[PDB]
Ligand binder design. Structure first.
Ligand code: MG
Ligand code: MG
Ligand code: MG
Ligand code: MG
Ligand code: MG
Ligand code: MG
Ligand code: MG
Ligand code: MG
Ligand code: MG
Ligand code: MG
Ligand code: MG
Ligand code: MG
Ligand code: MG
Ligand code: MG
Ligand code: MG
Ligand code: MG
Ligand code: MG
Ligand code: MG
Ligand code: MG
Ligand code: MG
Ligand code: MG
Ligand code: MG
Ligand code: MG
Ligand code: MG
Ligand code: MG
Ligand code: MG
Ligand code: MG
Ligand code: MG
Ligand code: MG
Ligand code: MG
Ligand code: MG
Ligand code: MG
Ligand code: MG
Ligand code: MG
Ligand code: MG
Ligand code: MG
Ligand code: MG
Ligand code: MG
Ligand code: MG
Ligand code: MG
Ligand code: MG
Ligand code: MG
Ligand code: MG
Ligand code: MG
Ligand code: MG
Ligand code: MG
Ligand code: MG
Ligand code: MG
Ligand code: MG
Ligand code: MG
Ligand code: MG
Ligand code: MG
Ligand code: MG
Ligand code: MG
Ligand code: MG
Lengths: 187, 105, 51, 147, 104
RNA sequence: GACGAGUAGGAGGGCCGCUGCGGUGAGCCUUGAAGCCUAGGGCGCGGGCCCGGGUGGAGCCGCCGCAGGUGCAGAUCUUGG
RNA sequence: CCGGCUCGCUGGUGUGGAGCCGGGCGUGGAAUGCGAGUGCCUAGUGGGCCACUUUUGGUAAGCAGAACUGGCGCUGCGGG
RNA sequence: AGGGGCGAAAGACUAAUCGAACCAUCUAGUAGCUGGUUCCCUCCAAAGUUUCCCUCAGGAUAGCUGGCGCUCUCCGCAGUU
RNA sequence: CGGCUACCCACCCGACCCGUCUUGAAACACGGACCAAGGAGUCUAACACGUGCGCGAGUCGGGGGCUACGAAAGCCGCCGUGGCGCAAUGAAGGUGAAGGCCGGCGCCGGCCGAGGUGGGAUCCCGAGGCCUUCCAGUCCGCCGAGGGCGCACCACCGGCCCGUCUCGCCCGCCGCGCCGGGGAGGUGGAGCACGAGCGCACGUGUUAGGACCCGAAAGAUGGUGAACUAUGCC
RNA sequence: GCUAAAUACCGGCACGAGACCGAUAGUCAACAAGUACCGUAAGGGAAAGUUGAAAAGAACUUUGAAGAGAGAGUUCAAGA
């Protein structure tokens, strides 16, 4: 035989979206063609993020893209987000933007158009730029989900700040024994 | 035998809850019954308002809701006597009256 | 129908707050998109020689 | 639906996905949270610290309305009033400042967290944080207390 | 009802199945557990680093000028080798052109 | 191109199987449906399936989705023979 | 390695040390082989046994108890 | 008349049931203990070991396992020397 | 004449009866005469994780109301009351989430304004070059030494918020008080540091429920028996 | 001390419906079912549906005492 172990002989990476959305699959077909027939890896990254699930493409806020496009050098570029561009209310002045996203909320798009921006989908983004030249690829905070507060080193352990699963935060709920140096021990 | 990580739960199912359980399979039927009784009442009092008598302006007691104004139980006797409306005729003409309401304002 | 479900630029006049859902893509004609000079120009040479 | 559940593919396997050495008995570890102090000590200490014991004082008749006091931040402070208020105040030449009655919106306490735009305001609230008030004073404005 | 007490037979195989990986060393190790007085000194130094900026900028400018003027002041067998030179695409183009003309 | 073992266990594909529901086949059917038998012709690795012959006389199936009281060799299993 | 700052710590001594910036050096500094790293949910398990060599109790045991490695368990096949 | 009756006393008899009768209900009482646990194919693939428990026929917790992925490439890692 | 396959027979090799417990099963281990039909992880609720859809710092009409299939479906918005999220910390009184620079006398006016480092997919610039006779030569592209602004994310250094400890000097007044506020340096927190949640559906895991199916020795409540028998009496 | 309304309903009367069950299922009971049957009693408690469209339920002959056959006849079909 062979001295080969098959623990990791199969890659776990995706090859297609797990959704039956026909519009998404049509965009997948377009970028599949672009990725396999162009030398630019931007299409390949967009194709990967298209394959990714809902939680792997968190909704990028308006504030993040404003701060990231405000960086010097990337003037009048094309901000491309594979996820969703959501309105952020803690901002007053919105500069002119070049936004390419799968979907934008009803008032965020109104705010950008009022500010003088332009929202274009991926089908017209391909026509504007096949290889994605003159574009900045942005992603939302993937660790921003509240579930990540519960992950990592276990709670009730020294040097471990992990949120415990408590049915109701309060005085009587998981506060006495493992949390205090008086009632036994504290970590 | 709790699992690795998760909440601690105290469900209140240790009694014989199946013996006393109420199901809402009659919810639409009860809605229709209320609607028919309401319409029958409305046509019974042909010119009178469907909602009934008139209730006064009232703001909620607690601190959480002292900035909101709701509907009252009835008009106070002091308010009625200022308005010159008798306590026995107010209900006849369709004015809600409850003698327990005070007026500290 | 327009007063019921609203136009793209005019919201529904009979619903409290509703508007037509925005398209994920506008130009759905994939063949027309692919067979355009803009995309075909920025492409690599095909390799249809089976080995 | 039961069509897609694992039990449909467990037919033909004797143990039905529960093991052959240690059978799926009824309650091998007691009922519910049994033995948290005795044989589940490791789990209840590695995942539920502070679970055992009392702490603090006891408030017998607790009413939430007395302690009801929602809070808002200065970044969302302008969101309460309409956009045309802010643009007209910015365009205004006589120096008149808009009055924001946060109580009418439904917030009693104002906390100063975000950046406040350079524009005079009159915040009429029930409570103020020290940093919130100093930010309003620094940006130029007034604070009005109401009961 | 006796039974064996302790065993460490298959443990090594269990460990090496996933590999006994060393901890992943990472640059800029944390500063926990150091002498508090030394830690206070370091934090004060990082706190007051800002004021000594203009002198640092001037020294950097002088050094850059010094290096700028410094750089301104400074500024097998032969038959096989021949055939390899001809066979090379870029440097053998003229040789291949001449031998093509030689065939004609 | 490389590889192919497997208990407990996990995952995926089932144009594998049963019952009913919403759509669909100008579907089938007293010029014969279901069921049953068959030394018949086959297909699919396999779950199983399609035709041929005999009884039957009144209902039956394929595809797309939905739902489950949905698959037996045992349990000193239950009932009947 | 080369310069320049910061320090409320320690000091004869711009001493000591640490931190922070700027500049330069690619023959990528043993062999061999291999794509790696990282995060969640989780079944089953938690009675073992045998063999070379090391070895404890017992005279000895197809005995009882340990260490490394490999197997049976979970495994068919050729030989005994 | 049942935790009662009766017993020249054997825990004897109390409707073939007596060291606590019979019937119905609570009750589908609990079981860390036995028995069984229903169609196919493909892929991956174990442990009987650490610690704690009135713990020793069991659990919790590490370890072993599988699934889902994700961040990068065409520097890193190693049951080796 | 062909038909491997499905019927029977003959021969050669192999070939212990299944299930289950067990380290070890063909076992002198237990269940099993045969056949047909039924038959065992389902449902409710809670939580967690992952995936699909809608909306998005909002989200949800689940309760109520208005208008054969239809007990459906649509609508309410001054029916979003309310749940979850948007703020945490403290037992509580409560508090509650950047700063730097300039001029005048700790205070006043103006300016810059919402962290830094290392690694960072992608993007931007371009020392030159990609030939059809050769030279200069432009336009559209393509590759590329090197240099950048650096997604997400990881690690570290910072900063801010609440409780606490120490050293402290100031500031304010309607009631100058056992008043209130502010700094620096350590420390504890399920925190902030330019959102990511809400609703519905699916799968998995755990739990309380009869809870995968069958199984006790027992306990309690209410009633029926001296037609056998035990004993007393007539 | 009285008082309708909105509220509860697995008993009862009369109704409508079902992504339910289809005679070992579904109520114990689709039928002369709480009937037969067992226990002194309290109580326990079943099995059991399908001729044919219409009985047109097989005239009449023949062996046997008859059960029951052999012909004949009814029916599309007694292979009902
Ligand atoms: Mg092989
Ligand atoms: Mg794997
Ligand atoms: Mg477990
Ligand atoms: Mg009313
Ligand atoms: Mg198995
Ligand atoms: Mg078993
Ligand atoms: Mg177990
Ligand atoms: Mg269980
Ligand atoms: Mg103990
Ligand atoms: Mg295999
Ligand atoms: Mg059914
Ligand atoms: Mg046969
Ligand atoms: Mg008929
Ligand atoms: Mg059987
Ligand atoms: Mg399992
Ligand atoms: Mg065991
Ligand atoms: Mg053991
Ligand atoms: Mg031994
Ligand atoms: Mg075993
Ligand atoms: Mg093995
Ligand atoms: Mg072997
Ligand atoms: Mg021999
Ligand atoms: Mg007595
Ligand atoms: Mg005795
Ligand atoms: Mg007893
Ligand atoms: Mg049971
Ligand atoms: Mg394998
Ligand atoms: Mg035990
Ligand atoms: Mg033989
Ligand atoms: Mg067994
Ligand atoms: Mg056992
Ligand atoms: Mg044994
Ligand atoms: Mg066996
Ligand atoms: Mg033997
Ligand atoms: Mg025996
Ligand atoms: Mg046995
Ligand atoms: Mg037997
Ligand atoms: Mg069956
Ligand atoms: Mg999810
Ligand atoms: Mg709540
Ligand atoms: Mg879990
Ligand atoms: Mg269950
Ligand atoms: Mg029982
Ligand atoms: Mg007891
Ligand atoms: Mg007698
Ligand atoms: Mg009364
Ligand atoms: Mg109906
Ligand atoms: Mg029957
Ligand atoms: Mg039948
Ligand atoms: Mg029945
Ligand atoms: Mg029958
Ligand atoms: Mg019959
Ligand atoms: Mg029948
Ligand atoms: Mg017939
Ligand atoms: Mg017939």
């Amino acid at each position: 035989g062979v001295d080969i172990r098959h623990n990791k002989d199969r890659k776990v990476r995706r090859k297609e979206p797990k959704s039956q959305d026909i519009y998404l699959r049509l965009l997948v077909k377009l970028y599949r063609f672009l990725a396999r027939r162009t030398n630019s890896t931007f299409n390949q990254v967009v194709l990967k993020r298209l394959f990714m699930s809902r939680t792997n493409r968190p909704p990028l806020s308006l504030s993040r893209m404003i701060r990231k496009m405000k960086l010097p050098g990337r003037e009048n570029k094309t901000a491309v987000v594979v996820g969703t561009v959501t309105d952020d209310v803690r901002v007053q002045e919105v500069p002119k933007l070049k936004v390419c996203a799968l979907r934008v909320t009803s008032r965020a798009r109104s705010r950008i158009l009022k500010a003088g921006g332009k929202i274009l989908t991926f089908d017209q983004l391909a026509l504007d730029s096949p290889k994605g030249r003159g574009t900045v690829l942005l992603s939302g905070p993937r660790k921003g989900r509240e579930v990540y507060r519960h992950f990592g080193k276990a709670p009730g352990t020294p040097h471990s700040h992990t949120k415990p699963y408590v049915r109701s935060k309060g005085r009587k709920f998981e506060r006495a024994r493992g949390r205090r140096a008086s009632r036994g021990y504290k970590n | 035998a709790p699992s690795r990580n998760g909440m601690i739960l105290k469900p209140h199912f240790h009694k014989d809850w199946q013996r006393r359980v109420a199901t809402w399979f009659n919810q639409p039927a009860r809605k229709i019954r209320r609607r028919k009784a309401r319409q029958a009442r409305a046509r019974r009092i042909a010119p009178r308002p469907a909602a009934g008598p008139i209730r006064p302006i009232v703001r909620c007691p607690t601190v959480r809701y002292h900035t909101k104004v709701r509907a009252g139980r009835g008009f106070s006797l002091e308010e009625l006597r200022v308005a010159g409306i008798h306590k026995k005729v107010a209900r006849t003409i369709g004015i809600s009256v409850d003698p327990r309401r005070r007026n500290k304002s | 129908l327009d007063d019921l479900y609203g136009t793209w630029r005019k919201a529904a006049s009979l619903k409290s707050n509703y508007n037509l859902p925005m398209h994920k893509m506008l130009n759905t004609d994939l063949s027309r998109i692919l067979k355009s000079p803009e995309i075909q120009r920025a492409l690599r040479a095909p390799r249809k020689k089976i080995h | 639906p039961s069509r897609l559940r694992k039990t449909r593919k467990l037919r033909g396997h004797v143990s039905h996905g529960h093991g052959r050495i240690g059978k799926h008995r009824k309650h091998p570890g007691g009922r519910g949270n049994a033995g948290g102090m005795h044989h589940h000590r490791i789990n209840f200490d590695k995942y539920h610290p502070g679970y055992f014991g009392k702490v603090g004082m006891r408030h017998y008749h607790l009413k939430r309305n007395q302690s009801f006091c929602p809070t808002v931040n200065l970044d969302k402070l302008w969101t309460l009033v309409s956009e045309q208020t802010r643009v007209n105040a910015a365009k205004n030449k006589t120096g008149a400042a808009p009055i924001i009655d946060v109580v009418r919106s439904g917030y009693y306490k104002v906390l100063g967290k975000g950046k406040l735009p350079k524009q005079p305001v009159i915040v009429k609230a029930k409570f103020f944080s020290r940093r919130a008030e100093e930010k309003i004073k620094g940006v130029g404005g007034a604070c009005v207390l109401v009961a | 009802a006796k039974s064996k007490n302790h065993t460490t037979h298959n443990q090594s195989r269990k460990w090496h199945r996933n590999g006994i990986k060393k901890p992943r060393s990472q640059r800029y190790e944390s500063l926990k557990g150091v002498d508090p007085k030394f830690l206070r000194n370091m934090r004060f130094a990082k706190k007051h680093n800002k004021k000594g900026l203009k002198k640092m900028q001037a020294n950097n400018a002088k050094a850059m000028a010094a290096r700028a003027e410094a750089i301104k002041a400074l500024v097998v067998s032969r038959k096989l080798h021949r055939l390899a030179y001809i066979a090379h695409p870029k440097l053998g183009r003229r040789a291949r052109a001449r031998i093509a003309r030689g065939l004609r």
